[PDB]
Structure formats: C-alpha cells, structure tokens
C-alpha cells in the first residue's frame, strides 16, 4: 500500500549518526581552525555539509565527482579520553573547493550514505523498486530529513543539506559551485545576523 | 499519515548488512567447525540467529540478558585477501547456550541493531513516538524483514529470526531456551529433510 522506505532511512540516519556526530562538530572544527588559520590563513566552515544527489549516485571518492572538490585533510576527533561522549572513529573529511585551481572555500563534506541503500534497492529485482520509485524516495528522504532537523535542538544549526538533480539533458553539473554557493551564503548570513 | 519507519529500517538492514554478511557465513562456520568438532566435539549451527526482542531492548552484552547465553568465541573472517568480496571487519560472535551449566547448543547469535533506533526514537520527544508506536513498529520490522527473506536467494536459508515479547506480567523469560528451541528444531529439520 503506502510503502515509503525513505521515512525509516531518514530517521535512522538522524538517530544513529547525525545526532551523535553533530554536537561535537563545532568544537572539533574550531580546534582545527586555530591551526588552519595560522597555517594557510583559511577557515573551515562550521557546518557539516551533506551531499544528497537525487540520483543516489554515491562515489567512494568525492574528487571523481568533481576535480574541483579536493581532499584537504582529516578532521581530528574529540578530546575526552574513554568510551567517548560519542567520539568513536567516524572519519570526517575536510575538502577545499576550487575555482580555476585556486581555493575558494573549505568545508567538512560527505554523502548521505542512506542514498546508497536506495540505489542498491533499485538494482535488487525482488524489491520491485524502479528508478522512478528511487527518485521519489530520494526526494522524500530529503524532505523527511529536513523536517527532522527543523525540530532538532540546533542539530539544524550544525549541518546543511545540499540536494541536487543533475542534467539528464546531460550538460555537466558543477557540484563544487553548488557547494561554493552554500558556503558563501552561509558566510553572508553569519556576517549579517 | 501512513508513517512506518520499520519499512526502511528493515530494507536497510537487509541491503546494507544481511545481504553482505550471509553469503560467506556458511563457509566461515564450516571452516571453524572443522576445528570446533576436533576440539570440543561440538558443532556450531550454520544459520545466523537474529534476536528481535519486541521491546527493542538491546544490551551491549548478551550475557546480561541471560547468564545461560555465554560468549564462546569470535567467528574468524573470509580468506580472500584484498578489499573483500564483502569481508570487512564485521564482528560475529559464537555463543554456547547452557542448561544447568552444561552446553546444550552453540550458534552465531546477535541482535537486530535497527531495534535500537526504534528504542532511541521512543526516547526522543520531538518524534511523537510512543511505546505503543514502538511496539507496533517492532512487529512490523519483523514481518517486513521476514517477507524480504522469503523472496531472497537463500539469504532465507542463511539466517533465523527469533522475535519475542516478554512478560510484562513479569515472570522472567528464558532467552536461552527460546534459542535452544530453534536450534533443536533446526537440527530436526536438517536430519529429516
Ligand atoms: Ca551523480
Ligand atoms: Ca529485554
């Protein structure tokens, strides 16, 4: 009947990952920026950027999606020293966004992994899950996840969703520019607020 | 409207975990049994047993749920030697089931982790998710997961679901006996088939 896998995938993504990772994020980014400012006179944005390609195409390397999205460094962990608070090994990567080979921006960036599940499901024949179903569930994942963060205790403030449909008329996208767009708007806000 | 997180949680559990772990399971259990037979003259069942406590109570140690469910050993990995096939570090534990301090059975056993998500959601007030909602979604998780394995290419044959509601009239359960029940029925089948 009313089957919507995106509901559980979004809730699970929030409860089992974002809720755990986001509280400590700002401090880990600050404590890295004290050095990144000193070294390269740059600054890493404080929000986790989440890629949500509506086509559910998740590469295992970001740079293969865009040579202007370049791995810079690993974001180090939290400092409390037993169990965690919820500091375990989650790897978070910092990327520099390029324009003409020059650095135009810098952020912690990653794909929302539950879209891989939607892709794998569309390739699993016994699921009866078409590419049109997949797209519909991708959009519903985004909207569900958005609603969740709207009522979340500044988990909202800790991350930014970047959903995008790509040309099937098949110009190339610029993911780096889409991301750069968000980073610049974010800085505008932080400085006019 | 029709909100059912259990659908995505079950699909995600199957696609992102069970589908990957189950194909190699029998061989890893055989290749361990060649030794376990030789050592203790015992035998580890070939099916992955999945605990689905409908109360969504997942302890981080099985023996705290039952002193008659005792950790025996780690099941070693697959043998192919780069990337995986999908052999990564997933830890699978072998437990001996006890009766009067004696070994009555032996199996790879674990909790279906997505029930933790349902528990965490019931404790998250902004989710508007009651304990009655949680129970309803636990049952729906089980049924959804069952239907999936029914059409699965002997993923069905590789695992066994053990769902249980516990006394709220509050006698104690015996989880070890519930599990032992399944192991004995499984052996009966294997030997009458
Ligand atoms: Ca793509
Ligand atoms: Ca329990």
How do the helices and strands line up, and which of them pair or pack?
The structure is a homodimer of 193-residue chains.
Chain A: H1 5-40, E1 48-53, H2 62-65, E2 69-75, E3 92-99, E4 102-111, H3 114-122, H4 131-150, E5 159-164, H5 175-192
Parallel strand pairs in A: 1-4, 1-5
Antiparallel strand pairs in A: 2-3, 3-4
Helix pairs in contact in A: 1-4, 3-4
Bound molecules: calcium ion (CA) (2 copies).
Radius of gyration of chain A: 17 Å
Q: What string, H for helix and E for strand, traces the elements of chain A in order? A: HEHEEEHHEH
**Estimated structural class of chain A:** alpha/beta
**Ions, cofactors and other bound molecules:** calcium ion
Number of domains of chain A: 2
Sheet with the most strands: spatial strand order of chain A:
2-3-4-1-5
Number of helical runs of chain A?
Answer: 5
Catalytic activity (chains A, B): H(+)(in) = H(+)(out)
Protein name (chains A, B): Stimulator of interferon genes protein
GO biological process, one term (chains A, B): protein complex oligomerization
Family (chains A, B): Belongs to the STING family.
